[PDB]
Amino acid sequence: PTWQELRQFIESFIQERLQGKLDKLQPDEDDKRQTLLATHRREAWLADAARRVGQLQLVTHTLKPIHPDARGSNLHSLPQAPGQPGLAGSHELGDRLVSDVVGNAAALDVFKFLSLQYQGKNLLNWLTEDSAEALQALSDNAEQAREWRQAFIGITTVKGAPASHSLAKQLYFPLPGSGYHLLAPLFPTSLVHHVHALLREARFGDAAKAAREARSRQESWPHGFSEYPNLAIQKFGGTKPQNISQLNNERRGENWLLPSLPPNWQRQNVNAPMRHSSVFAHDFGRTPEVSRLTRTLQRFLAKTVHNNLAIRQRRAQLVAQICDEALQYAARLRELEPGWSATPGCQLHDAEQLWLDPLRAQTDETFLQRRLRGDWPAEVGNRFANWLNRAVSSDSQILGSPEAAQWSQELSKELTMFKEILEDERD
Amino acid sequence: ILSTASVLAFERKLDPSDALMSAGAWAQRDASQEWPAVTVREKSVRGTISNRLKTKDRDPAKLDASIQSPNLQTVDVANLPSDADTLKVRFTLRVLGGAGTPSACNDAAYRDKLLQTVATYVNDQGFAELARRYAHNLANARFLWRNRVGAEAVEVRINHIRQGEVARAWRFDALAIGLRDFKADAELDALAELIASGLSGSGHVLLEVVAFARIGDGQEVFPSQELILDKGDKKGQKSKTLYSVRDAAAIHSQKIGNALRTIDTWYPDEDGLGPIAVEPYGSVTSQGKAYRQPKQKLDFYTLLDNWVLRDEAPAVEQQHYVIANLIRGGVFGEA
Amino acid sequence: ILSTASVLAFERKLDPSDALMSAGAWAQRDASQEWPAVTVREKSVRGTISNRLKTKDRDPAKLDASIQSPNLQTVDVANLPSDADTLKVRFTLRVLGGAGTPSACNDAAYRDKLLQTVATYVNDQGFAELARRYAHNLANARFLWRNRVGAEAVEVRINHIRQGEVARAWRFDALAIGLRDFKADAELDALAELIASGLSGSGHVLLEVVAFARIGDGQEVFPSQELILKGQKSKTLYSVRDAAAIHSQKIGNALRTIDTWYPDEDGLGPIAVEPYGSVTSQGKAYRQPKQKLDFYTLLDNWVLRDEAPAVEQQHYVIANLIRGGVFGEA
Amino acid sequence: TISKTDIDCYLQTYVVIDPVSNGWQWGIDENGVGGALHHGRVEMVEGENGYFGLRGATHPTEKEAMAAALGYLWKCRQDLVAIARNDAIEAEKYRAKA
Amino acid sequence: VTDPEALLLLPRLSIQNANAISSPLTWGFPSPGAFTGFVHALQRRVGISLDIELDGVGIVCHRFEAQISQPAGKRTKVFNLTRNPLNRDGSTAAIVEEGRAHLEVSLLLGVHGDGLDDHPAQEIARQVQEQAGAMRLAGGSILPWCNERFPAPNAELLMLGGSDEQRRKNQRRLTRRLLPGFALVSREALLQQHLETLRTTLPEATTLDALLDLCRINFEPPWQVRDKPGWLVPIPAGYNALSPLYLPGEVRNARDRETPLRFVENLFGLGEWLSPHRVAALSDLLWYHHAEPDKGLYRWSTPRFV
């Protein structure tokens, strides 16, 4: 916090840039050393930095990821937190802001100069507050240091009138009474950089690679790890990502979008269950979802029931999910053809074919329509329960205890719901 | 002073869908509702090098050792079946209407002047030259892009779909209707008047365009190829991916729209190409050259500024091009 | 100056289909439309080590220990059935025309110069030498690649298909018509004038080429082969839908085997029309660019600086323009 | 210089070790999440006589079922191995960076 | 907000190039702001003439196909793009990656007003469907169903039931009609209580991290994966203010110069794809707007869910 050591640090940094240019210069003639030591070695480099602060800008929400021929206004704005619970984004960054920089890529020497952590903090925040060590180390004149401060503090101030381009997005939002607001959203590069760093740390970090070794060795570990499936890479600069922002050079494009996908985003096809007789075990149970569901029940049905509520709610919602995928299987099977049980056979599940093909009633007006409306074919739930009791293990310790009675109770409860849904199929 | 709007945005009128291609036999085109879909499958290719050497790698050792290490690609290929010689390409077209009304306009002065200018056009000469050419590019199957270049017979069927059914049906010989002459015809004039009444009215006109092309047994059909950057590592890389909606090959909707917009025979360069697509700074992606440059006063921005701002109305051809851009859509506007 | 264009994309003329292979008995080749297709199936193979040892594996304990545990595999094999001695390979071939026109070209003046060059070629000499050799490669069943080499009698039936029906039907003996001499026949010249009328744009030509090869009962046929992603699966064969097939680019490569004009010896016979005319089997590129006889130097002298090559070399150049390709620099 | 167990670090998410009463039967998760309940596209296979379960021998310990799973993935399915290879290379570059 | 008097059902609408990029952090199904803005545009275009107030939308998504591809040797996905026109000099334009997805959603619209009495139910259902056929739902065209087996019609279900059994009966009749999909709701109470649990685990936790924790599949040591209650997707649940509210003719290059502009920023909340018979009342699960514009915090959710 003495001005002499900060003077030593700034002259040391510009002398490091001097030896950097004289190392990556490869000059032997033309006398570039004179103009090189006249430009980047004296205190006129700070005058050129006070010129170059106007080209750069510390930004938190830039507009350049929206279509890059959009010359709008970028913001270093931190939003206030919602009082409403649940949702949040980009105001959660309290000390973990990365403070993106847009502008010229050859002008980033000013940002490398501002990113120094010389005493205990950045020189930026030292230039915000009034201090004696500030405004005196980098000068010998007072008013020149004042105008240098007013130049150097302007990297966090938005330049120009507020503007969002025609290529930028702006979207009407209806107020509760009769109004609209324009709502031009900006791209959060600091939030994307924080989520990108979190994802790279959870996937490639040392504490994650250690638990990844411990699962591949099948050993035990203190902590676990994470996967983040179904990510999508969205790149912003095509072949030149430097023109979008500074942080889009660290992540070369690579937005790393999270999957907000519906569960029927892998919808394979529907095949009419012709050559079988127990559709819950051949075409329904062969689906990739209910196999995982029944295996998770088989894991969850043979254990200690001391955690009665937590295991009981899990088994109830799992049986609800299995009867749910049964109802979705019967629902999506109605797009096949109106008649496929009319295709002749001998063993084709003639009690479940009253359920999975209701459009034979449109063809057989009195022959097959009146045989499912008076019977109301809903004994399918009992066969569904006989299929679902193959998920429980054949253990006498599971049979004698109250676990079998509680399992049968909530299983019959969800089967009452599923059968009551199948009861009123005719409205 | 009537400056230009800083935000201009016209929606896309003439909004097609993905052209589903299926397959069967000619002389049962009338029962082509259960024709099986052309599926996109993979095949393996192995090729030698054929691109130009860069005058430093022309020596025979490197060339002969480079034909011993060939590139091995898995490409997507869509073919007709070996018992089907006819390709049925089917899509739907919505002709929306409200063709001069912008979806976004800053200035109410510029908006009112542009609506006054568009209404002056429509009363002076309606959508009858534009929709005639749109009906041509429907009638000749220009949307069959490479699926047309060797066909024995192309036949386009267009059905005006009203509230539940076909209100009025057309049927064209798409090879008699050329890809370069926007002539006159009675049924083309009826279809043009329908596309005009769609582009004028407040509601959409829905058409069902089906084009059968008698290619040959087992021949290759050419659906749209997908713009996939980052194909990945070269081992399991699929070097060509063909577009297909649901296990059924297809042409992209913007490719069908690009074929429908090919009405522009008004650009100042000579018509060795004939019609090109209506674009601001009218630029053919296959030619790599932008006609209608701003160094001449014949692009869409200069003509729209002269027509709306200072009332220098162009000729009827260039104002056809301007209103065709307004039907085409686009995001215009300066900073 | 008239430099060459940076994009140049010629569409492929002479489009073949995937050559489906069926299987039946000879002397009922005429009723060969219900012939069951050759199915690609799996058999397990097991071979001892037979490649060259790299001077370190010639240790006898290492050699015997590698022989004691040989590699198991599971190849895809396609055979004729044991009661069927004939292979019917059936494709269609569509001859398009418009050969000198590119599908993509930056320069308009270069495209005009190239079109004038190809037009002067066609006006001086049509597609009459080219279509003769293409009709030969249809007539001698070169598209039967290894299905031809030990066949007793190969017979090709080429049908020109107008409207929906057979307009003019040829029937050749593919073993009397050799693989290396382009002689003259009446029916070969009729097929050549048809492929000429197709390649000039003066008609619509869709041929259907059926080739019967009398191999033997139960013998092995050779469809096209895919690249592969104990049971190592060392060979994967092509098939469209449970029916073995040859790739269409293999059929087209056999149809382009017309280039008898390369500067080396004529002992090999015709090779395929490729720029820097290369054979993958022999590992050698004839028409190297160091001699002035590859496609690019001949084209850039014929079109840019108006040095018209020899008549056979411009036959080769227009055969490349019929062939297709992505020409043009970066 | 990326070793085999660092590739196994990202290859182990493609396997699933289901518990049976005899032992531990490994399987293959095609979506790479260890057989998760919702995001997990597990690979089920058809065997000799009505076998619809995980491809994998019922091993006594999880240490050997996972090892047989990794050995199967290394022998046969080299696309998931290339996935795990590129994951391991990006992890090594990440520790070279951060 | 206010309860729907009736519940209109737009049937399975096919959208061909919807915005797969929901937000800067999420891809997949488009944002619920797209659907709420579509229903406000339906109100703005046909609802002010039928004297009804179309408010609240329930999103169902029978079929979803994203135009994505998985590159070779990569675990993640990239987007299949479109080839834009050239520049005026003939070069290829700079590629801006947009995600396109083919949807098949059916919308449940809350309808309340005095126009329910003045008009028949099928008339206003037909009018909002014939107006929706000329519209777009997330940037993608609504395919208008020509020449299939039969066109899917509407049903405006009056939520006022004469009895509770009849009300449960026609909720079942509507749920059976929109069954092969999965209704999208908002679970932000679950996000907050998961944040509270993660804060009792480790202090100084943000609910961005709790949202991520509900997104991942966590592997746990003894190995087992941590189970989840439902599908639990991340959705953009609105906007948060970055700038103060600017006057209409004050900001530069706005959409209109008669509406106050304010630079905003996404607010990622939690969603949950559940089947429509798990709600037991379809007059819930409808997405409304909540502005509170003096604070910022322009957001959508489905209140009255649980």
Author numbering:
A (entry chain A): 8 to 434
B (entry chain I): 24 to 358
C (entry chain H): 24 to 252, 258 to 358
D (entry chain J): 3 to 100
E (entry chain B): 3 to 224, 239 to 322
What's written in the study?
The Csy complex is composed of four Cas proteins including Cas5f, Cas6f, Cas7f and Cas8f in a stoichiometry of 1:1:6:1, and a 60-nt crRNA that integrates all these protein subunits. Consistent with previously reported structures, the Csy complex adopts a helically twisted ‘G’ shape with Cas5f, Cas6f, Cas7f and Cas8f protein components integrated by the crRNA. Target DNA binding and R-loop formation induce conformational changes in the Csy complex, enabling it to recruit the Cas2/3 nuclease for degradation of the invading MGEs. Here, we report the cryo-EM structures of three type I-F Acr proteins, AcrIF4, AcrIF7 and AcrIF14, bound to the type I-F CRISPR–Cas surveillance complex (the Csy complex) from Pseudomonas aeruginosa.
AcrIF4 is a 100-residue protein from the JBD5 phage composed of a helical domain and a β-strand domain. AcrIF4 is clamped between the spiral backbone of the Csy complex and Cas8f. The β-strand domain of AcrIF4 fits against helix α1 of Cas8fHB. In the middle, D20 and P21 of AcrIF4 engage R299 and R302 of the helix α1 of Cas8fHB by a salt bridge and a hydrogen bond, respectively. On one side, F54 of AcrIF4 forms a cation-pi stacking interaction with R293 of Cas8fHB; on the other side, L39 of AcrIF4 forms hydrophobic interactions with L300 and L325 of Cas8fHB. The helical domain of AcrIF4 interacts with Cas8fmid through a network of contacts including three salt bridges (AcrIF4-D8:Cas8fmid-K216, AcrIF4-D89:Cas8fmid-R210, and AcrIF4-R97:Cas8f-D213) and extensive hydrogen bonds. Target DNA binding to the Csy complex induces a 180° rotation of Cas8fHB, which is essential for recruitment of the Cas2/3 nuclease for cleavage of the substrate. These interactions observed between AcrIF4 and Cas8fHB indicate that AcrIF4 may prevent the rotation of Cas8fHB, thereby locking the Csy complex in an inactive state. Structural comparison between the Csy-AcrF4 and Csy-target dsDNA suggest that AcrF4 does not compete with PAM recognition or hybridization between crRNA and the target strand of dsDNA. Consistent with this observation, electromobility shift assays (EMSAs) showed that the Csy complex was able to bind to dsDNA substrate in the presence of AcrIF4. Third, AcrIF4 primarily binds to the Cas8fHB, a binding site that was not reported in other AcrIF proteins.
